[PDB]
C-alpha cells in the first residue's frame, strides 16, 4: 500500500558525488514531512536531514551540513538526497522516512534502505565455484550442495537457486571479511540425494555493485 | 550529542524488561515527542511507540512508553523469543534537530542446546584448475552462539590461510557459522586428508575430507 523505494545508492571513491532518490506511492505524498535516516553497518540509526510538505523548509545533522541536499518533486513524489564530498564515515544504508501527520520526527513508513559504500577501494565481481555433494551421497539419504562465492567488493550478493524457484532447505551463510579487504560466502541447498541424477541445480549469484550475474551449475562427483 | 539508551538488555521468556533513553531538558525532557523504534537483522526499522506512550494499530499492548524528567522508558511484557531486536528511542530537540539513541540489543535467552551441523567441502576442480584451493567448512543450528574451529592436516594444526566468521544468528533463531582454510593446489595435493573440527560445549564434531 504505503510505498517507499530508494535508488541510486552503490559504491563510490572518498571525494566524490551520489544522489539518492526515493519514488512513493500509495499516500498524498505532497502533504508530508520527509526525511533521509542513515545507519553505518552494525551501528545506529541517525537522522541526515528533513524536508516540509512544500520543500520550502529544510533542516541538516551537523556531520551533512554544507555537503548534502534534501530536495522533492511533489509532482513525481520523489525525495532527493544530493551527496556530494562523500568520505568512508559517510558509508551507511540510507532509509527515506515518512513523518506521521501530527509529528514532526514520528516515522510511520520506512523504506528498504539503498546502501552507499565510500572506499578507496574498487570493485571486484565474484568467482563462483560449484560445492559438488560429498561422493557418497547418492548412497544415502540427503545431500548438501552449494555454491563458493569468492573475492567481491563491496557487500552484498544474493544467492537464489534454480532461478528462485528452489526456497526450500536453502542456507546462504553470512560473509567472511578476509584480511585481503575482499568478502567470500557460501550458500548450501539440503536436498535427497536421490534427486541428484533427476534434478538439476543451479545458484544463480548477483552482485549489483560490479554488474555480475552468474549461474553454475552444481553437478555431483 | 546522542540519547543514552543501555547497549545491552537480556532477559527470559514471559519475562519484563525496561529501555531506558535519557536526553536533556532541550529533548526528551523538554517535549512529549519521544518514539520508539524495533529493528530486526536486515530489516527496516518498525514504529512502536509515538509521543511517549501511544501504540500505532497492530503493535500488541506487550509494548508500552512511559516519561519521567529526561528519560523515557519501553517497557516489553510477556518476552517472546521475535522481540529480540534493536531498540532505539527518538525525540525532537529545541534545535529543531532530530535525534536517536544509541539503541539497545534485546536479547532473549531459554531456548535448547543445540549442537552444530558440520558440512565440510574440498576445493572443487574449477577452483584447483584456477591454482587456487579453498575448503570450506559451514557450522550450523547450534546454540549458545560460541564455537571453536580447528584445522587439521592428517595430524598436526594448521594456522596459516584459516579465516572464520562471528557466529550469527540466522532465520530459525540459532547460530551459523563459516570456517574457510585457503591452500595452494599443490598443499593440497601433498596431503592424505584435511580435517574441520568445531567445538561447542565441550563436544567436538570433526568432518574429513580427501583428494580422492
Known amino acids: 500500500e504505503v510505498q517507499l523505494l530508494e535508488s541510486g545508492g552503490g559504491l563510490v571513491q572518498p571525494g566524490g558525488s551520489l544522489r539518492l532518490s526515493c519514488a512513493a506511492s500509495?499516500?498524498?505524498?505532497?502533504?508530508?514531512?520527509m526525511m533521509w535516516v542513515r545507519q553505518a553497518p552494525g551501528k545506529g540509526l541517525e537522522w541526515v536531514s528533513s524536508?516540509?510538505?512544500?520543500?520550502?523548509?529544510?533542516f541538516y545533522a551537523d556531520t551533512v551540513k554544507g555537503r548534502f541536499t534534501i530536495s522533492r518533486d511533489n509532482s513525481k513524489n520523489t525525495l532527493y538526497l544530493q551527496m556530494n564530498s562523500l568520505r568512508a564515515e559517510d558509508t551507511a544504508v540510507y532509509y527515506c522516512?515518512?513523518?506521521?501527520?501530527?509529528?514532526?520526527?514520528?516515522?510511520?513508513?520506512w523504506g528498504q534502505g539503498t546502501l552507499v559504500t565510500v572506499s578507496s577501494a574498487s570493485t571486484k565481481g565474484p568467482s563462483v565455484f560449484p560445492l559438488a555433494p560429498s561422493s557418497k551421497s547418492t548412497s544415502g539419504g540427503t545431500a548438501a550442495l552449494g555454491c563458493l562465492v569468492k573475492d567481491y567488493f563491496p557487500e552484498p550478493v544474493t544467492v537464489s537457486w534454480n532461478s528462485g524457484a528452489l526456497t526450500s532447505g536453502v542456507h546462504t551463510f553470512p560473509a567472511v571479511l578476509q584480511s585481503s579487504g575482499l568478502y567470500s560466502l557460501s550458500s548450501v541447498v539440503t536436498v535427497p540425494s536421490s534427486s541428484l541424477g533427476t534434478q538439476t541445480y543451479i545458484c544463480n549469484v548477483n552482485h549489483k555493485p560490479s554488474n555480475t550475474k552468474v549461474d553454475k551449475r552444481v553437478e555431483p562427483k | 550529542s546522542a540519547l543514552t539508551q543501555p547497549a545491552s538488555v537480556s532477559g527470559s521468556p514471559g519475562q519484563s524488561i525496561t529501555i531506558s533513553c535519557t536526553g536533556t531538558?532541550?529533548?526528551?525532557?523538554?517535549?512529549?515527542?519521544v518514539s520508539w523504534y524495533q529493528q530486526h537483522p536486515g530489516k527496516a526499522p518498525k514504529l512502536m511507540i509515538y509521543?511517549?506512550?501511544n501504540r500505532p494499530s497492530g503493535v500488541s499492548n506487550r509494548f508500552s512508553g512511559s516519561k519521567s524528567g529526561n528519560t523515557a522508558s519501553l517497557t516489553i511484557s510477556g518476552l517472546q523469543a521475535e522481540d529480540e531486536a534493536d531498540y532505539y528511542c527518538?525525540?525532537?530537540?529545541?534545535?529543531?534537530?532530530?535525534?536517536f539513541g544509541t539503541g539497545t540489543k534485546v536479547t532473549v535467552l531459554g531456548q535448547p542446546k543445540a549442537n552444530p551441523t558440520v558440512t565440510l567441502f574440498p576445493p572443487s576442480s574449477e577452483e584447483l584448475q584456477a591454482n587456487k584451493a579453498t575448503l570450506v567448512c559451514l557450522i550450523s543450528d547450534f546454540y549458545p552462539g560460541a564455537v571453536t574451529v580447528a584445522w587439521k592436516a592428517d595430524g598436526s594444526p594448521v594456522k596459516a590461510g584459516v579465516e572464520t566468521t562471528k557466529p550469527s544468528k540466522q532465520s530459525n533463531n540459532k547460530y551459523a557459522a563459516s570456517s574457510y582454510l585457503s591452500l595452494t593446489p599443490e598443499q593440497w595435493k601433498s596431503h592424505r586428508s584435511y580435517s574441520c573440527q568445531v567445538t561447542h560445549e565441550g563436544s567436538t564434531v570433526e568432518k574429513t575430507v580427501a583428494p580422492t
Open positions: 522516512a515518512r513523518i506521521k501527520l501530527g509529528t514532526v520526527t514520528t516515522v510511520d513508513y
Open positions: 500509495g499516500f498524498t505524498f505532497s502533504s508530508y514531512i
Open positions: 524536508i516540509y510538505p512544500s520543500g520550502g523548509i529544510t
Open positions: 531538558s532541550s529533548d526528551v525532557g523538554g517535549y512529549n515527542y
Open positions: 509521543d511517549v506512550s
Open positions: 527518538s525525540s525532537y530537540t529545541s534545535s529543531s534537530t532530530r535525534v
